[PDB]
Design an enzyme around this catalytic site. Structure first.
Site, PDB file in Angstrom:
ATOM      1  N   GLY A  10       0.787  -1.223   0.000  1.00  0.00           N
ATOM      2  CA  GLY A  10       0.000   0.000   0.000  1.00  0.00           C
ATOM      3  C   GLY A  10       0.816   1.268   0.000  1.00  0.00           C
ATOM      4  O   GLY A  10       2.004   1.255   0.336  1.00  0.00           O
ATOM      5  N   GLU A  11       0.157   2.379  -0.365  1.00  0.00           N
ATOM      6  CA  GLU A  11       0.736   3.721  -0.456  1.00  0.00           C
ATOM      7  C   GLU A  11      -0.364   4.758  -0.167  1.00  0.00           C
ATOM      8  O   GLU A  11      -1.517   4.571  -0.564  1.00  0.00           O
ATOM      9  CB  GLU A  11       1.399   3.904  -1.855  1.00  0.00           C
ATOM     10  CG  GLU A  11       1.308   5.278  -2.509  1.00  0.00           C
ATOM     11  CD  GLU A  11       2.416   6.254  -2.173  1.00  0.00           C
ATOM     12  OE1 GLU A  11       3.149   6.657  -3.106  1.00  0.00           O
ATOM     13  OE2 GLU A  11       2.529   6.650  -0.990  1.00  0.00           O
ATOM     14  N   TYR A  14       0.575   8.462   4.697  1.00  0.00           N
ATOM     15  CA  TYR A  14       1.211   7.775   5.823  1.00  0.00           C
ATOM     16  C   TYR A  14       2.610   7.351   5.369  1.00  0.00           C
ATOM     17  O   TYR A  14       3.554   7.342   6.159  1.00  0.00           O
ATOM     18  CB  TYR A  14       0.384   6.549   6.311  1.00  0.00           C
ATOM     19  CG  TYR A  14      -0.037   5.562   5.234  1.00  0.00           C
ATOM     20  CD1 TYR A  14       0.767   4.472   4.904  1.00  0.00           C
ATOM     21  CD2 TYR A  14      -1.271   5.677   4.600  1.00  0.00           C
ATOM     22  CE1 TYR A  14       0.380   3.557   3.924  1.00  0.00           C
ATOM     23  CE2 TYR A  14      -1.671   4.763   3.624  1.00  0.00           C
ATOM     24  CZ  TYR A  14      -0.835   3.715   3.275  1.00  0.00           C
ATOM     25  OH  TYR A  14      -1.246   2.803   2.327  1.00  0.00           O
ATOM     26  N   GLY A  15       2.717   7.043   4.079  1.00  0.00           N
ATOM     27  CA  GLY A  15       3.928   6.568   3.431  1.00  0.00           C
ATOM     28  C   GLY A  15       3.613   5.302   2.666  1.00  0.00           C
ATOM     29  O   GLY A  15       2.525   5.175   2.099  1.00  0.00           O
ATOM     30  N   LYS A  16       4.537   4.339   2.672  1.00  0.00           N
ATOM     31  CA  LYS A  16       4.319   3.077   1.967  1.00  0.00           C
ATOM     32  C   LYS A  16       4.420   1.873   2.887  1.00  0.00           C
ATOM     33  O   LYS A  16       5.106   1.926   3.910  1.00  0.00           O
ATOM     34  CB  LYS A  16       5.286   2.929   0.778  1.00  0.00           C
ATOM     35  CG  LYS A  16       4.984   3.853  -0.395  1.00  0.00           C
ATOM     36  CD  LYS A  16       5.724   3.415  -1.642  1.00  0.00           C
ATOM     37  CE  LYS A  16       5.543   4.381  -2.784  1.00  0.00           C
ATOM     38  NZ  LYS A  16       5.941   3.781  -4.087  1.00  0.00           N
ATOM     39  N   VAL A  17       3.712   0.791   2.521  1.00  0.00           N
ATOM     40  CA  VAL A  17       3.740  -0.499   3.207  1.00  0.00           C
ATOM     41  C   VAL A  17       4.300  -1.510   2.202  1.00  0.00           C
ATOM     42  O   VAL A  17       3.743  -1.659   1.116  1.00  0.00           O
ATOM     43  CB  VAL A  17       2.362  -0.944   3.785  1.00  0.00           C
ATOM     44  CG1 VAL A  17       2.476  -2.290   4.507  1.00  0.00           C
ATOM     45  CG2 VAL A  17       1.773   0.119   4.714  1.00  0.00           C
ATOM     46  N   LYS A  33       6.308  -0.763   7.273  1.00  0.00           N
ATOM     47  CA  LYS A  33       5.613   0.501   7.080  1.00  0.00           C
ATOM     48  C   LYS A  33       6.619   1.634   7.329  1.00  0.00           C
ATOM     49  O   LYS A  33       7.231   1.704   8.400  1.00  0.00           O
ATOM     50  CB  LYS A  33       4.392   0.590   8.015  1.00  0.00           C
ATOM     51  CG  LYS A  33       3.568   1.862   7.861  1.00  0.00           C
ATOM     52  CD  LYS A  33       2.388   1.872   8.822  1.00  0.00           C
ATOM     53  CE  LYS A  33       1.187   2.550   8.205  1.00  0.00           C
ATOM     54  NZ  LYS A  33      -0.005   2.478   9.092  1.00  0.00           N
ATOM     55  N   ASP A 120      -9.945   4.392  11.961  1.00  0.00           N
ATOM     56  CA  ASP A 120     -10.063   4.111  10.534  1.00  0.00           C
ATOM     57  C   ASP A 120     -10.299   2.621  10.284  1.00  0.00           C
ATOM     58  O   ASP A 120      -9.609   1.995   9.471  1.00  0.00           O
ATOM     59  CB  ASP A 120      -8.886   4.694   9.708  1.00  0.00           C
ATOM     60  CG  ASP A 120      -9.226   4.926   8.232  1.00  0.00           C
ATOM     61  OD1 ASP A 120     -10.393   4.667   7.833  1.00  0.00           O
ATOM     62  OD2 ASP A 120      -8.335   5.377   7.481  1.00  0.00           O
TER      63      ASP A 120
HETATM   64  C1  LIG Z   1      -3.545  -2.283  -4.103  1.00  0.00           C
HETATM   65  C2  LIG Z   1      -4.256  -3.508  -3.608  1.00  0.00           C
HETATM   66  N1  LIG Z   1      -3.398  -4.718  -3.576  1.00  0.00           N
HETATM   67  C3  LIG Z   1      -4.183  -5.961  -3.504  1.00  0.00           C
HETATM   68  C4  LIG Z   1      -4.854  -6.103  -2.154  1.00  0.00           C
HETATM   69  N2  LIG Z   1      -3.858  -6.104  -1.077  1.00  0.00           N
HETATM   70  C5  LIG Z   1      -4.508  -6.286   0.229  1.00  0.00           C
HETATM   71  C6  LIG Z   1      -3.555  -6.585   1.367  1.00  0.00           C
HETATM   72  C7  LIG Z   1      -3.579  -5.846   2.540  1.00  0.00           C
HETATM   73  C8  LIG Z   1      -2.686  -6.107   3.561  1.00  0.00           C
HETATM   74  C9  LIG Z   1      -1.760  -7.148   3.377  1.00  0.00           C
HETATM   75  N3  LIG Z   1      -0.764  -7.467   4.297  1.00  0.00           N
HETATM   76  C10 LIG Z   1      -0.412  -6.923   5.503  1.00  0.00           C
HETATM   77  N4  LIG Z   1       0.108  -7.810   6.367  1.00  0.00           N
HETATM   78  C11 LIG Z   1       0.470  -7.324   7.563  1.00  0.00           C
HETATM   79  C12 LIG Z   1       0.337  -5.975   7.918  1.00  0.00           C
HETATM   80  F1  LIG Z   1       0.632  -5.606   9.187  1.00  0.00           F
HETATM   81  C13 LIG Z   1      -0.202  -5.104   6.907  1.00  0.00           C
HETATM   82  C14 LIG Z   1      -0.387  -3.634   7.055  1.00  0.00           C
HETATM   83  C15 LIG Z   1       0.243  -2.917   8.075  1.00  0.00           C
HETATM   84  C16 LIG Z   1       0.020  -1.571   8.232  1.00  0.00           C
HETATM   85  F2  LIG Z   1       0.597  -0.931   9.273  1.00  0.00           F
HETATM   86  C17 LIG Z   1      -0.796  -0.834   7.379  1.00  0.00           C
HETATM   87  N5  LIG Z   1      -1.151   0.501   7.296  1.00  0.00           N
HETATM   88  C18 LIG Z   1      -1.942   0.583   6.258  1.00  0.00           C
HETATM   89  C19 LIG Z   1      -2.580   1.839   5.793  1.00  0.00           C
HETATM   90  N6  LIG Z   1      -2.154  -0.626   5.620  1.00  0.00           N
HETATM   91  C20 LIG Z   1      -2.723  -0.805   4.259  1.00  0.00           C
HETATM   92  C21 LIG Z   1      -1.659  -1.224   3.262  1.00  0.00           C
HETATM   93  C22 LIG Z   1      -3.913  -1.746   4.282  1.00  0.00           C
HETATM   94  C23 LIG Z   1      -1.399  -1.567   6.355  1.00  0.00           C
HETATM   95  C24 LIG Z   1      -1.224  -2.936   6.181  1.00  0.00           C
HETATM   96  N7  LIG Z   1      -0.580  -5.602   5.711  1.00  0.00           N
HETATM   97  N8  LIG Z   1      -1.732  -7.889   2.254  1.00  0.00           N
HETATM   98  C25 LIG Z   1      -2.612  -7.596   1.284  1.00  0.00           C
HETATM   99  C26 LIG Z   1      -3.100  -4.843  -1.129  1.00  0.00           C
HETATM  100  C27 LIG Z   1      -2.419  -4.680  -2.479  1.00  0.00           C
END
Ligand SMILES: CCN1CCN(Cc2ccc(Nc3ncc(F)c(-c4cc(F)c5nc(C)n(C(C)C)c5c4)n3)nc2)CC1
Length: 263
Positions: A10-11, A14-17, A33, A120
Site C-alpha cells: 500500500g501507499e 502515511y507513506g508506503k507499506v 511501514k 479508521d
Molecule cells: C492495491 C491492492 N493490492 C491488492 C490487495 N492487497 C490487500 C492486502 C492488505 C494487507 C496485506 N498485508 C499486511 N500484512 C500485515 C500488515 F501488518 C499489513 C499492514 C500494516 C500496516 F501498518 C498498514 N497501514 C496501512 C494503511 N495498511 C494498508 C496497506 C492496508 C497496512 C497494512 N498488511 N496484504 C494484502 C493490497 C495490495
C-alpha cells in the site's frame, strides 16, 4: 540491511507499506511501514511496543521498530476486502460471519481497554490469516468515509464508540459483500446513513456543530433486513446497537462480546 522489500502492499498519506523478506528470521515475510519526520510520535510508538507485550491474537504482531520510522509487523496474506471478493456463492458461511465478528470485537476490546482508538476501521485494514484468524492493522499512529461514525462526520466527538459504528458497517458488509453506506462526501455519507436508521431525536443531535438536524429530511427508519438479507434476529439486534446514532447509547466492544448472538 536486515530486510529485503519484494512487493508493495500500500501507499498513501502515511507513506508506503512493503511485503519484505526478514533475512535474520529464516526469510519469513514481514510487512514494513515507512513514516515521515517529534514527541507525540515517540509516545505513540511506546504505546505500540506496550500493546505488543500482551501479544493479543487479534492484532498484528509488532516484530521491530527502526530509526525515517520503520514499523516491522508479522505479514498476513490477505485483507477482508480480498476475502469477501473471493468467497463462493451464496456468500460467507453464517458461522464464519459469527466467528470473524467475535474476533474483530476481541481485538477491538483489547485496543479500547488499553485506551487506543482505531479511528479508521475498514475491511482494508482487517487482515485474514491462512487459518482464518482476524488481525487488526493500521492503528496507534496519527480516503473512504463509508465506515465513518456520524459524530466524526458532524465533527463533534471522537471517543471509542467511533469504532463500534465501523464494526456495524463491517458486520452488514460480511452478509451483503458490498458496503452498507457508500457516500461520496461527509454530507452525502450522513444522508445515506439517516436514509436507513432514520432521523434521531433533536436531543440526540450534537450541539454547536455546523450541520443541524433540519439539514436532513430522511424521514423514517427503514427495516434493516431489507439492506441486510439473511441476517438472524440476534445479529439484527447487535447490528442496530452498533449502528446507534448517539455514541453514548452505542454498545461497547465489551458488551458486544456478551451479546446473545455469540452464545
Ligand atoms: C492495491 C491492492 N493490492 C491488492 C490487495 N492487497 C490487500 C492486502 C492488505 C494487507 C496485506 N498485508 C499486511 N500484512 C500485515 C500488515 F501488518 C499489513 C499492514 C500494516 C500496516 F501498518 C498498514 N497501514 C496501512 C494503511 N495498511 C494498508 C496497506 C492496508 C497496512 C497494512 N498488511 N496484504 C494484502 C493490497 C495490495
Amino acid at each position: 540491511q536486515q530486510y529485503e522489500c519484494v512487493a508493495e502492499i500500500g501507499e498513501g498519506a502515511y507513506g508506503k507499506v512493503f511485503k519484505a523478506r526478514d533475512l535474520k528470521n529464516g526469510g519469513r515475510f514481514v510487512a514494513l511501514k515507512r513514516v515521515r519526520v517529534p514527541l507525540s510520535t515517540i509516545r505513540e510508538v511506546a504505546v505500540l511496543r506496550h500493546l505488543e507485550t500482551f501479544e493479543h491474537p487479534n492484532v498484528v504482531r509488532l516484530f521491530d521498530v527502526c530509526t525515517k520510522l520503520t514499523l516491522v509487523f508479522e505479514h498476513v496474506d490477505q485483507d477482508l476486502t480480498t476475502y469477501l471478493d473471493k468467497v463462493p456463492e451464496p456468500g460467507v458461511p453464517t458461522e464464519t460471519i459469527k466467528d470473524m465478528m467475535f474476533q474483530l470485537l476481541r481485538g477491538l476490546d483489547f485496543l479500547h481497554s488499553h485506551r487506543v482508538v482505531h479511528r479508521d476501521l475498514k475491511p482494508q485494514n482487517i487482515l485474514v490469516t491462512s487459518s482464518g484468524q482476524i488481525k487488526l492493522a493500521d492503528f496507534g499512529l496519527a480516503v473512504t468515509l463509508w465506515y465513518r461514525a456520524p459524530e466524526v462526520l458532524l465533527q463533534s466527538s471522537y471517543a471509542t464508540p467511533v469504532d463500534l459504528w465501523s464494526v456495524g458497517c463491517i458486520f452488514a458488509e460480511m452478509f451483503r459483500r458490498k458496503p452498507l453506506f457508500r457516500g461520496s462526501s461527509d454530507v452525502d455519507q450522513l444522508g445515506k446513513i439517516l436514509d436507513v436508521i432514520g432521523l434521531p431525536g433533536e436531543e440526540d443531535w450534537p450541539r454547536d456543530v455546523a450541520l443541524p438536524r433540519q439539514a436532513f429530511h430522511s424521514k423514517s427508519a427503514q427495516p434493516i433486513e431489507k439492506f441486510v438479507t439473511d441476517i438472524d434476529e440476534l445479529g439484527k439486534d447487535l447490528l442496530l446497537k452498533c449502528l446507534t446514532f448517539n455514541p453514548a447509547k452505542r454498545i461497547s466492544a465489551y458488551s458486544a462480546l456478551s451479546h446473545p448472538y455469540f452464545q
